[PDB]
Amino acid sequence: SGMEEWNFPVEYDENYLPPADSRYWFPRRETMPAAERDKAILGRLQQVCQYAWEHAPFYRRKWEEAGFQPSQLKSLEDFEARVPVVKKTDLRESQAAHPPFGDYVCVPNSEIFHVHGTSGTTGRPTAFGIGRADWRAIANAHARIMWGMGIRPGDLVCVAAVFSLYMGSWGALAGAERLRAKAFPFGAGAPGMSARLVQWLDTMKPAAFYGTPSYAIHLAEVAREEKLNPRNFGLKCLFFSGEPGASVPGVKDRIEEAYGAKVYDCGSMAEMSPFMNVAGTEQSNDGMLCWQDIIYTEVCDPANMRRVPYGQRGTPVYTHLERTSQPMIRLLSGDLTLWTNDENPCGRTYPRLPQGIFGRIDDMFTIRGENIYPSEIDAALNQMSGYGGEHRIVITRESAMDELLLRVEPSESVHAAGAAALETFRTEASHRVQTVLGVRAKVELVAPNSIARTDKARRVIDDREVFRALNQQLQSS
């Protein structure tokens, strides 16, 4: 095949840096005939499915009840048709039965290097247990993809996303470290951090910046209040993940204008680290490329989980080709995208997402880069005695970043107990909701029976102008 350092389990040369003239970090893997890479991906899929069958009782159970065995994997058509999709709810149930990391972890406990996770659910939150070898594989894949964006060794890379449970910032960091770039992990989340960060960007003048697209808009506003020019931060490129925006003109163009630098979209899911497997390149700067030999992406018809033709829309379904810990095999994203397989300006022979990722097959939405499930807001409110049985969700972006508004009904008893009791229920609901979601929601009370009861109810209003036209087009096609 000629594919660079192509084996499972993967074990990249940590000293490899491509020649300075090279556009591609791995010229063969990135430009080889797609049909040839597809033969190699099938070969890999077979090893990964065999590996999961032997080390993941989660997959053995799932595949047995679907009537699938690794011996039945003969083509990519067998892969889409026979292998059932994994849902995030299955992953959550596996961990409830086999904590801390489910019976899909595969690796022994002694191999676990970092513990990360997610927020958003009531009950026990899901944990990520990333093996030592997978951390190196993620670092190596991200450095390759960041090289694709024009980021080079020695470049100062500002990671201005929270360093906590979430894989986003850790992935951009691990990528910067492997690239021999000067990683600058400023982080995020403490009120006051933005005013200090703009001083550090004016002083350090990094070549690259990573965060959420809306945070970069917020930071431009902060730099101006701080009497700083964001055009003088020395930025060559900004790359974002966590939410839609970097492939949306009314978002991307405002960032390119504020900073005078190119913006790159990247990012699938945290369960899919290396999450930059979907990422734009310096020449293919609009939307994202599907880096198929790192993670195998299939854009699927959600009714049958089969690949849609190119030029068509569907839901991304992902498979780890280079992970031994918690490998995801056909994980259903639930997102929507249009994929195409035309000639890319950068020369990479990868499928493309020309407008990035937008929209969902379910009722999930994002608030400041955080996934929000309305069923989870409903479960959190129903755990409260003072809850009056009904609520409404209003999403706005009146300033640079999202605001989540909850209009909650108090019980009649709480309302009768007076203004003090009412205010106590509101603050307790806000505390409970924030602990569950991982983000601050704004909570307001309405009259005890003022909201309509529709016994499934559609409680969410997405009032974000920047996504309105995109939400209407999902209703046209």
Ligand X SMILES: CC(C)(COP(=O)(O)OP(=O)(O)OC[C@H]1O[C@@H](n2cnc3c(N)ncnc32)[C@H](O)[C@@H]1OP(=O)(O)O)[C@@H](O)C(=O)NCCC(=O)NCCS
Binding residues: 88, 190, 192, 194, 218, 270, 335, 368, 371, 440
Contacts of 39 (CB under 8 A, 6+ apart): 1
* Packing angle of the helix pair 213-225, 249-259 (nearest 10 deg): 40
Site stretch for ligand 8LE (CB under 6 A), options 132-140, 144-152, 262-270, 400-408? 262-270
Exactly one of 23, 36, 113, 354 binds a copy of itself (CB under 8 A); which one?
113
Nearer to a copy of itself, 152 or 231 (CB): 152
Q: 185 to each of 43, 143, 160, 203, how far by Cα in Å?
A: 38, 16, 7, 15
Nearest to 218 by CA among 195, 199, 242, 243: 195
Residue 147 interaction partner, one of ligand 8LE, a copy of itself, ligand X, none, beta carbon < 5-8 Å per kind: none
Distance, in Å, from the CA atom of 351 to the CA atom of 335, rounded to the nearest integer, reads 17
Which residues in the chain are followed by a discontinuity, with C-to-N distance exceeding 2.5 angstroms? Answer: 455
Q: Decide: is 427 part of the binding site for a copy of itself (CB under 8 A).
A: no
Q: Decide: is 244 part of the binding site for ligand 8LE (CB under 6 A).
A: yes
* Secondary structure class of 48 (helix, strand, coil): helix
Nearer to ligand X, 85 or 395 (CB): 395
Nearer to ligand X, 280 or 388 (CB): 280
Q: Decide: is 334 part of the binding site for ligand X (CB under 6 A).
A: no
Q: How many CA atoms lie within 13 A of 246 on its CB side?
A: 33
Site for ligand 8LE in 367-396 (CB under 6 A): 371
Token representation of residue 32: 């080889």
Q: How many residues does the chain have?
A: 477
Residue 153 interaction partner, one of ligand X, a copy of itself, ligand 8LE, none, beta carbon < 5-8 Å per kind: a copy of itself
* Packing angle of the helix pair 213-225, 193-204 (nearest 10 deg): 80
Residue 333 interaction partner, one of a copy of itself, ligand X, ligand 8LE, none, beta carbon < 5-8 Å per kind: ligand 8LE
Token representation of residue 318: 């992902």
Nearer to ligand 8LE, 73 or 377 (CB): 377
Nearest distance from residue 45's CB to ligand 8LE, in Å?
Answer: 22
* Secondary structure class of 135 (helix, strand, coil): helix
Exactly one of 213, 280, 351, 369 binds ligand X (CB under 6 A); which one?
369
Distance, in Å, from the CA atom of 449 to the CA atom of 474, rounded to the nearest integer, reads 33
Nearest distance from residue 15's CB to ligand X, in Å?
Answer: 29
Q: Decide: is 154 part of the binding site for a copy of itself (CB under 8 A).
A: yes
SS (H, E, C) 291-333: CCCCEEEEEEECCCCEECCCCCEEEEEEEECCCCCCCCCCEEC
Exactly one of 102, 120, 148, 211 binds ligand X (CB under 6 A); which one?
211
Q: Decide: is 185 part of the binding site for a copy of itself (CB under 8 A).
A: yes
Residue 218 interaction partner, one of ligand X, a copy of itself, ligand 8LE, none, beta carbon < 5-8 Å per kind: ligand X
Distance, in Å, from the CA atom of 83 to the CA atom of 66, rounded to the nearest integer, reads 8
Nearest to 294 by CA among 267, 320, 324: 320
Q: Decide: is 284 part of the binding site for ligand 8LE (CB under 6 A).
A: no
Residue 265 interaction partner, one of a copy of itself, ligand 8LE, ligand X, none, beta carbon < 5-8 Å per kind: ligand 8LE
**Residue for token digits 């894989």?**
167
Q: Decide: is 277 part of the binding site for ligand 8LE (CB under 6 A).
A: no
Phi then psi for 370, rounded to 5 degrees? -110, 130
Q: Decide: is 119 part of the binding site for a copy of itself (CB under 8 A).
A: yes
Cβ neighbours around 302 below 10 Å, total: 16
Nearer to a copy of itself, 226 or 256 (CB): 226
Nearest distance from residue 189's CB to ligand X, in Å?
Answer: 3
Q: Which amino acid is at 126?
A: T
Region label for 419, one of left (φ > 0), alpha (ψ between -120 and 50) or beta (otherwise): alpha
Number of residues interacting with ligand 8LE: please give it, by CB under 6 A: 21
Q: Which residues bind ligand X (CB under 6 A)?
A: 161-162, 166, 168-169, 188-194, 211-212, 215, 218, 241-242, 368-370, 401, 438-440
Which positions touch ligand 8LE (CB under 6 A)?
A: 118, 167-168, 241-244, 246, 265, 267-271, 275, 333, 335, 356-357, 366, 371
Binding residues for a copy of itself (CB under 8 A): 99-100, 109-110, 112-117, 119, 124-125, 127, 129, 132, 153-154, 156, 162-165, 170, 177, 180, 182-187, 189-193, 195-196, 199-200, 203-204, 226, 431, 434-435, 438, 440
